[PDB]
């Protein structure tokens, strides 16, 4: 199979600026018939992908002239000349030249904004859940930028990896920030055997982590 290597994975831009997305193929994708079936697709959240560019450089019906595809051989480029709000989403290259046909890994086109630290909130398990024999500790990390963040859980000073589930929102349409939930699920027995619970967020905005914690005995 022809591997399509698409970079960058993520591409922050301000509205009005130009975006450039690269697609490299592991071999040439010129067909025997002389055509190069290199296609660019845009997929928005909850929608089917839509064709923008076909045969390397031809705009599909309805596609604005701000979208321009170029390249040849093994190196291809999509340029969006003055990025608008309707252009945000994930871009994929596709080769239809040699079976099996293959997609690039995608490029998320997103809004560049000022770096913002997360607002971190930690929640002990509710009395209602505890009554049921479960114990979930929830941490929200809200309205931060950029999206890159690392969250560590510590229980009595020791990092926990088992039973942590993370979920991330898409970039917010209003303020262009990202949010995240991190949830540690334990048995009630496990929960009651430890004292200190900490959600620790390391983000670009501070060299020191944001540390939110509670002590079970202080509840």
């Amino acid at each position: 199979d022809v591997l399509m290597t698409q970079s960058p994975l993520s591409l922050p831009v301000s509205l009005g600026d130009q975006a450039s997305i690269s697609c490299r193929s592991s071999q040439t994708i010129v067909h025997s018939n002389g055509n190069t079936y290199l296609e660019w697709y845009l997929q928005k959240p909850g929608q089917s992908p839509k064709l923008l560019i076909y045969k390397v450089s031809n705009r599909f019906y309805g596609v604005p002239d701000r979208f321009s595809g170029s390249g040849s051989g093994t190196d291809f480029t999509l340029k969006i000349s003055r990025v608008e709000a309707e252009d945000l989403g994930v871009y994929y290259c596709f080769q239809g030249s040699h079976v099996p046909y293959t997609f690039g890994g995608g490029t998320k086109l997103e809004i560049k904004r000022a770096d913002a630290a997360p607002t971190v909130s930690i929640f002990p398990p509710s009395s209602e859940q505890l009554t049921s024999g479960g114990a979930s500790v929830v941490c929200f990390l809200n309205n931060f930028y950029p999206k890159d963040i690392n969250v560590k859980w510590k229980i009595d000073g020791s990092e926990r990896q088992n039973g942590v589930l993370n979920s991330w929102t898409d970039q917010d349409s209003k303020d262009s920030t990202y949010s995240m939930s991190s949830t540690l699920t334990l048995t009630k027995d496990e929960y009651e055997r430890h004292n200190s619970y900490t959600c620790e967020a390391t983000h670009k905005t501070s060299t020191s982590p944001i540390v939110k914690s509670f002590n079970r005995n202080e509840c």
Partner: protein, 216 residues
């Protein structure tokens, strides 16, 4: 004047097969190929296969052993059939025209979400997330929605009237059931006097639950 409509099951038991019908309009299957693509949750697009105007097929190498595409030219139908589905075949499956040659019929199906699971219909447990003892202008509250199947649930706050400063996170699998949370940030100048209530609906179980968030 061009669309592709899909019919298939939303839920498949592990080890059972998946059949999807793609019904095309605005172009002829006797002249154009139709492709199948899927997208696993939070992953990129993967090409699965194609059925060409003349009836021959090509497949992604990882699916040759269990995928077959067929069609009916006169009825504008294309049939996707895949065997031995496992949980990691959960995906949105698309039929579409791509590898555009002489035409402008590059349209996609709306896609068929297929979940592969042995789980039974299970309503969520809903737990309030209220501030632990620990005072700026805003307070963050939430609801934890745990242990439901299938997707989706819908979460609103104060019956939809509180929409600003809500983040409802995508659901994740915990064993074979789904969990999510929703956070809402509200002014400390109005809470708790002005009440805040998450409303959780799970249509599959006909569950509608209200959880009022009160101070601990």
């Amino acid at each position: 004047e061009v669309q592709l409509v899909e019919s298939g099951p939303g839920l498949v038991q592990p080890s059972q097969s998946l059949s999807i019908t793609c019904t095309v309009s605005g172009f002829s299957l006797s002249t154009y190929g139709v492709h199948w693509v899927r997208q696993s949750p939070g992953k990129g697009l993967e090409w699965l296969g194609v059925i060409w105007s003349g009836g021959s097929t090509d497949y992604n190498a990882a699916f040759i052993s269990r995928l077959s595409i067929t069609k009916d030219n006169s009825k504008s139908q294309v049939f996707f059939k895949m065997n031995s589905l496992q949980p990691n075949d959960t995906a949105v499956y698309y039929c579409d025209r791509m590898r555009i040659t002489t035409d402008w019929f590059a349209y996609w199906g709306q896609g068929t979400l297929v979940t592969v699971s042995a789980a039974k219909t299970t309503p969520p447990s809903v737990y309030p997330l209220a501030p632990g003892s620990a005072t700026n202008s805003m307070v963050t509250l939430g609801c934890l929605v745990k242990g439901y199947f299938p997707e989706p649930v819908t979460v609103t706050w104060n019956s939809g009237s509180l929409s600003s400063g809500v983040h409802t996170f995508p659901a994740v699998l915990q064993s074979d059931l789904y969990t999510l949370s929703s956070s809402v940030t509200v002014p400390s100048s109005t809470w708790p006097s002005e009440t805040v209530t998450c409303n959780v609906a799970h249509p599959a179980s006909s569950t509608k639950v209200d959880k009022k968030i009160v101070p601990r």
